[PDB]
Swiss-Prot record, chain A:
Outcome after substituting residue 123 to D: Severe loss of catalytic activity without affecting cooperativity between the 2 ATP-binding regions. Slight reduction in growth rate
Protein origin, superkingdom: Eukaryota
Similarity comment: Belongs to the AAA ATPase family.
Main location: other
This protein's name: Cell division control protein 48
Other remarks on this protein: Present with 78400 molecules/cell in log phase SD medium.
Record note on quaternary structure: Component of the heterotrimeric CDC48-NPL4-UFD1 ATPase complex. The CDC48-NPL4-UFD1 ATPase complex interacts with the HRD1 ubiquitin ligase complex composed of the E3 ligase HRD1, its cofactors HRD3, USA1 and DER1, substrate recruiting factor YOS9 and CDC48-binding protein UBX2. Interaction between the complexes is mediated by interaction between CDC48-NPL4-UFD1 complex member CDC48 and HRD1 complex member UBX2. Forms a complex composed of CDC48, NPL4, UFD1, UFD2 and SHP1.
A GO cellular component entry from the record: RQC complex
Species whose genome carries this gene: Saccharomyces cerevisiae (strain ATCC 204508 / S288c) (Baker's yeast)
Example of a GO biological process term: SCF complex disassembly in response to cadmium stress
Residues annotated for ATP 1 binding in this entry: 65-71, 166, 202
Swiss-Prot record, chain B:
UniProt organism field: Saccharomyces cerevisiae (strain ATCC 204508 / S288c)
Further remarks about this protein from its record: Present with 1050 molecules/cell in log phase SD medium.
Residues of the full protein shown: 387 to 580 of 580
Family of this protein: Belongs to the NPL4 family.
Function (record text): Substrate-recruiting cofactor of the CDC48-NPL4-UFD1 segregase. Assists CDC48 in the dislocation of misfolded, polyubiquitinated ERAD substrates that are subsequently delivered to the proteasome for degradation. Involved in the import of nuclear-targeted proteins into the nucleus and the export of poly(A) RNA out of the nucleus. Required for the proteasome-dependent processing/activation of MGA2 and SPT23 transcription factors leading to the subsequent expression of OLE1. Regulates ubiquitin-mediated mitochondria protein degradation.
Subcellular location: Cytoplasm, Perinuclear region; Endoplasmic reticulum membrane; Nucleus membrane
Protein name per the record: Nuclear protein localization protein 4
Length: 224, 194
């Protein structure tokens, strides 16, 4: 009812830039939540000024790998049409000592400089694991830099941070407080209708034979 | 520039391969302090990351200091060593010259290349003989460039002239040149010119 009130209505404002809402299936509720948290603060920022609140920014998606977290983030970013800065966990962590912090600093600085922006920190568990797993001093410098950049952003507004991870506990607890990744979204395995939608999405360019029963495959595939 | 004692010593340098790759993407500019070079901003075309310059302290530890405002240029240099050939006469030089016919565009001073200077420099040797004297007067880099610019001699004549002036075996080539029609016209007009 009200929950999916944002989903109701060329395409994609008209590579990996072509992903859109039509390339996703079986996650109506989570997609509604993500869109309600991302589009409204950026596309229509005057609603919250009119009602007199500061919308939350940090969004933390998590679920089993393969559930489409990166797909959802990229689709939302491409549909919003806002300055989209993509940070990869391993890509930042592969840099030399002292560069993996400067990269984060410049990333946030650029995202703040430009127009309404979205920062997607894919695989945040790589750059901010639980303290017991943060072996070494560079693993602590990076976490502290992430925390400082997150804290210093709350004033700027018109910039939303999205993070994805496999498990809620895999992240440093200090990142899940007020003014940080406070709103949390959970992606679960799809149901029969979701699996049918995914199957239709993927098998739209194949030379399928006429004797294909995608409903049967949807019924058989459980836990996929 | 001059050495510590007050002389006219000469020094040779060469910028590193990263300064060479830094200037191409702008990213550097001169600063009012002679020893330090400025850094530009992240405009919409050129994107400058954070620049660190690494140095080792007296305790043998490398220290990285952020230098956005300005950093010394001593990290962008490598020093060569100059010198002169030993007094032993090897005579591998290509020219017994650099003292005579005026050099390139020094019109500010009285050094103005013109037909009168040729008539006074490279005419008495060409009016007497002494092929050795003519060869040592013809082996001047700037004289060769000037006569080329005169365009009186045809390309083959100038090729044989340069190979007569720069090659260790020049007797036959020098004789061919002095006997060549182009050289004869050149010397005739030079004599006629005053
Ligand atoms: N509705 C859907 N849900 C999930 N995946 C989908 C869906 N529709 C298509 N796919 C495809 O499934 C794969 C999902 O890969 P994806 O990178 O999104 O997974 P992920 O584990 O969430 O990501 P990552 O670990 O990179 O953050 C891609 O091939 C995507 O094209």
């Amino acid at each position: 009812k009200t929950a999916t009130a944002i989903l109701r209505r060329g395409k994609k404002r008209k590579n990996m830039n072509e992903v859109g809402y039509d390339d996703i299936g079986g996650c109506r509720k989570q997609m509604a939540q993500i869109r309600e948290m991302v589009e409204l603060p950026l596309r229509h920022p005057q609603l919250f000024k009119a009602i007199g609140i500061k919308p939350p920014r940090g969004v933390l998606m998590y679920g089993p790998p393969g559930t489409g977290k990166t797909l959802m983030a990229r689709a939302v970013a491409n549909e919003t049409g806002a300055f989209f800065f993509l940070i990869n966990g391993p890509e930042v962590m592969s840099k030399m000592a002292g560069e993996s912090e400067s990269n984060l600093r410049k990333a946030f600085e650029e995202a703040e400089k430009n127009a309404p922006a979205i920062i997607f920190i894919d695989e945040i568990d790589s750059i901010a694991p639980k303290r017991d797993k943060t072996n070494g001093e560079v693993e602590r410098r990076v976490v502290s830099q992430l925390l400082t950049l997150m804290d210093g952003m709350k004033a700027r507004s018109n910039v939303v941070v999205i993070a994805a991870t496999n498990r809620p506990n895999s992240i440093d607890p200090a990142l899940r407080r007020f003014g940080r990744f406070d709103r949390e979204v959970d992606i679960g395995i799809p149901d029969a209708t979701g699996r049918l939608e995914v199957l239709r999405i993927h098998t739209k360019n194949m030379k399928l034979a006429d004797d294909v029963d995608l409903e049967a495959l949807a019924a058989e595939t459980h836990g996929y | 520039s001059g050495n510590l004692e007050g002389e006219i010593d000469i020094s040779s340098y060469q910028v590193s391969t990263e300064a060479e790759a830094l200037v191409t993407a702008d990213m550097i500019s001169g600063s009012t302090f002679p020893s330090m070079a400025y850094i530009n901003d992240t405009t919409d075309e050129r994107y400058v990351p954070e620049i660190f310059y690494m140095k080792s302290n007296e305790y043998g530890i490398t220290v990285k200091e952020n230098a956005k405002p300005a950093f010394p240029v001593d990290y962008l240099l490598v020093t060569l060593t100059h010198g002169f050939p030993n007094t032993d006469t090897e005579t591998n030089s290509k020219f017994v010259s650099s003292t005579g016919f005026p050099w390139s565009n020094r019109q500010a001073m009285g050094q103005s290349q013109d037909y009168q200077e040729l008539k006074k420099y490279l005419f008495n040797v060409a009016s007497s003989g002494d092929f050795n004297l003519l060869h040592e007067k013809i082996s001047n880099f700037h004289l060769l460039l000037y006569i080329n610019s005169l365009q009186i001699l045809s390309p083959d004549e100038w090729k044989l002239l340069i190979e007569s002036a720069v090659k260790n075996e020049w007797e036959e080539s020098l004789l061919k040149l002095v006997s060549s029609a182009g050289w004869q016209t050149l010397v005739m007009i030079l004599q006629e010119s005053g």
